[PDB]
Amino acid sequence: MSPTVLPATQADFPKIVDVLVEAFANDPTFLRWIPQPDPGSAKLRALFELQIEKQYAVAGNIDVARDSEGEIVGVALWDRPDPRLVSIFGKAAARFHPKFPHWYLYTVATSSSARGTGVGSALLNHGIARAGDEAIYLEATSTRAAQLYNRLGFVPLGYIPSDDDGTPELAMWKPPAMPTV
Amino acid sequence: MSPTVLPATQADFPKIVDVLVEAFANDPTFLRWIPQPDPGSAKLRALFELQIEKQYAVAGNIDVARDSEGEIVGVALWDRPDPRLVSIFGKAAARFHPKFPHWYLYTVATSSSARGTGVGSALLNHGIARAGDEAIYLEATSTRAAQLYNRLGFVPLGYIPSDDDGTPELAMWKPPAMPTV
Secondary structure, X not given: OOOEXXXXXXXXXXXXXXXXHHHHOOXXXXXXXXXXXXXXHHHHHHHHHHHHXXXXXXXXXXXXXXXXXXXXXXXXXXXXXOOOHHHHHOOOOOOOOOOOOOEEEEEEEEOHHHOOOOXXXXXXXXXXXXXXXXXXXXXXXXXXXXXXXXXXXXXXXXXXXXXXXXXXXXXXXXXXXXXXX | OOOEEEEOOHHHHHHHHHHHHXXXXXXXXXXXXXXXXXHHHHHHHHHHHHHHHHHHHHHEEEEEEEOOOOOEEEEEEEEOOOOOHHHHHOOOOOOOOOOOOOEEEEEEEEOHHHOOOOHHHHHHHHHHHHHOOOOXXXXXXXXXXXXXXXXXXXXXXXEEOOOOOOOOEEEEXXXXXXXXX
């Protein structure tokens, strides 16, 4: 009885942001962009609200996983193949993505309460099935995660250099289907 | 009794260029860069002489395959991980290579006389063994070639857009070894 995955609806956006914030409140991957301290993760929260509203809701895919009690216990943000920022950063804005069409798995987050439930796996399987014959890029934040993604058909590209920051991320690629003939 | 592969020596450079020219004299991949007509493939010849002299001999690897009679029947040009041009083009000079360290297989050429001999396979196997745990990029010029490279562990990245030119090339990647632990 693994969680069930569907596209988000607008009514779900508050909980979705709550889940992202809980997952990433102490993650170096996000802390590096947001000036610290960030009491109550308020600036991180604003970042996620903006990304959902102006990027993922619009031109991407937002998947949610729900448990058997109906609550959202995970979220994934995907990009498809192809002012308020002064308040979050006081300044941001690709380069290591291969220059070929691909899906991008930006983030996958699981509620603390739902750790060890197969939430992340259900999300990835959903997104991989949607991607089908097309390619996927992601950046794995641990060797453990990299090994999970490798078992799902991602091959390594290499490590992205980090300044200031924690573990270098391992860029990975799930290739597109080979040409039939 | 497949051909045997070793690094080239300077004494071999004339024959190496002869082999490249014979292989590529009518190849759209090269014809697109060189102003036509090119009587006797003289400008193409000059290009290969310059690439060997100033790039591959210096900072790369040049492999040759020899047959049982001792003659060079194939050549491969590899880049390692990291004025006269007015005479060739009347203007040249990366972008689709992933931004991670890799070997690049620039060209593999087989003598006409040695077609169907396993020359290309011997060259690739040699270069793959040298590359070991490291990544390799190449651009395959047919689906047939792409399938050969896929069987040697290359995965597709995607097609590179061509202007003026024949078959789009299929960029491919042989991944580096996954991290041990």
